[PDB]
Amino acid sequence: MQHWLDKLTDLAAIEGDECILKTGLADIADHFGFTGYAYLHIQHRHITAVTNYHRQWQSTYFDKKFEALDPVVKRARSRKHIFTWSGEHERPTLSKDERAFYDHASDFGIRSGITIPIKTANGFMSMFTMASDKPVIDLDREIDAVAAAATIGQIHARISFLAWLDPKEATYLRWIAVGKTMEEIADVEGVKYNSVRVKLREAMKRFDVRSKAHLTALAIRRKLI
Amino acid sequence: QHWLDKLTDLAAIEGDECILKTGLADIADHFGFTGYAYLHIQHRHITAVTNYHRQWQSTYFDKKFEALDPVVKRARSRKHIFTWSGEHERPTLSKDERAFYDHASDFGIRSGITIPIKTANGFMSMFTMASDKPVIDLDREIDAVAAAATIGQIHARISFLRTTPTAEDAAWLDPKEATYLRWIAVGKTMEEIADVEGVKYNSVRVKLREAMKRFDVRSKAHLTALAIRRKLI
DNA sequence: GATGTGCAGATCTGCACATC
DNA sequence: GATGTGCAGATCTGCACATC
Lengths: 225, 233
Ligand SMILES: CCCCCC(=O)CC(=O)N[C@H]1CCOC1=O
Ligand SMILES: CCCCCC(=O)CC(=O)N[C@H]1CCOC1=O
Description:
The structure is a homodimer.
Chain A: H1 4-11, H2 18-31, E1 36-42, E2 47-51, H3 55-63, H4 71-78, E3 83-86, H5 87-90, H6 96-106, E4 112-120, E5 124-132, H7 145-160, H8 167-176, H9 182-189, H10 193-206, H11 212-221
Antiparallel strand pairs in A: 1-2, 1-5, 3-4, 4-5
The complex binds 3-OXO-octanoic acid (2-OXO-tetrahydro-furan-3-yl)-amide (LAE) (2 copies).
Chain B binds a DNA duplex through helix 10.
Function (chain B): Positive regulation of conjugal transfer of Ti plasmids. TraR activates target genes in the presence of AAI and also activates traR and traI themselves.
GO molecular function, one term (chain B): DNA-binding transcription activator activity
Family (chain B): Belongs to the autoinducer-regulated transcriptional regulatory protein family.
């Protein structure tokens, strides 16, 4: 199947509100074995988030102003380049406080991750993180920093631009719109043929159409894609 | 200082496209370039947003230079910022490429900086700053990572907010193709189209597959999508 | 209800050929 | 070239039923 960066690039192109996007982001994170994801926009010390991290951890994170303690945000602020982090692996040279921070985050299964930080308008920044409950992130192939940046640039803009087709309906329909067969969609998305078949036939039924070409035309005409 | 930063700031302003294109043109000028060019590529089907001379835009597509331009070739091959130069590449270039670059020079396009990225559904987009200088003499190399981050945002601003192409490759449908394709777009089968338009099933079959051949698409859904996207229906 | 499984028959797509 | 013929195999659509 395609990489999650490609999945994110595809998602950045679908229509819909924040709710639709979050459903899609969570599914991608889950699909690739991550416990959650988090998008953060940071201007100075002011942060806004689009994440599926436990609400309890989010509240604590905001309440105790962890943006100023989180080693991940520190690195992101320091260098705009994708990186992997690990609470366990980073232990040495981590203040007693940064240590307490990681132990608390561990209670939520946030122990390691991959983060992609980029510069955005007005000298501010945005970062996207894929979190794991594993001790460390082990990768056979290093992720292309350039491709990672291009992907997050699109994801950031899409979020900044914030009935509808759901993420799977939209994502699958978009591939139908570029000539893919359902088997090919199953392969690139890493899902079962039947999941693609079921999702799309339901879309067809809800819109009362008899062919993919009709669903495609109606979706485009109605700005659903 | 740093046009990449200016582009990032511009990618954030939401308003009508007329202001976006003006902003892009202004940045290109401010930093000493002859102009800019954004291309969204979907296998030979290309849409452009650029302030390159209107005549060059017309020639570029009428001659299908996308298939000749070494800049596009390199972009399709590797998604990484690069600088190009007609004069510097001379030795490497064939007779058609040299000529190609010659015509471009007539429009103030002799060298440039191009940033290509991958976009949704296996396609790509690229942003170029063109100069009239024989070569780009950069004092400091432009960070490929930062460049990608910027163009990812510019691509989303142009594409997601549905900007009007300033130029694109020629794609059309003759009267019959259009008539039959409109029916396909509302759920009809080839047979049903034959009955309603009072023609042979083979007439509909051949008219549409030839159109599919011309657009280079594998399915009717794809032909339908490109046709609607291009306003042919 | 949300999804998934199966498949018969409907349709289309890819290829080789033929005719206007 | 534009249009038309022929068809095996690819691919989809509609309906019935299964899972949990
Ligand atoms: C609003 C919720 C906080 C999101 C924080 C973020 O983006 C970066 C990050 O994953 N930091 C990790 C590392 C240890 O705990 C975390 O949460
Ligand atoms: C529609 C106008 C064509 C834009 C093509 C483009 O984006 C890349 C590019 O700069 N190619 C250059 C190099 C020689 O001529 C050009 O135009």
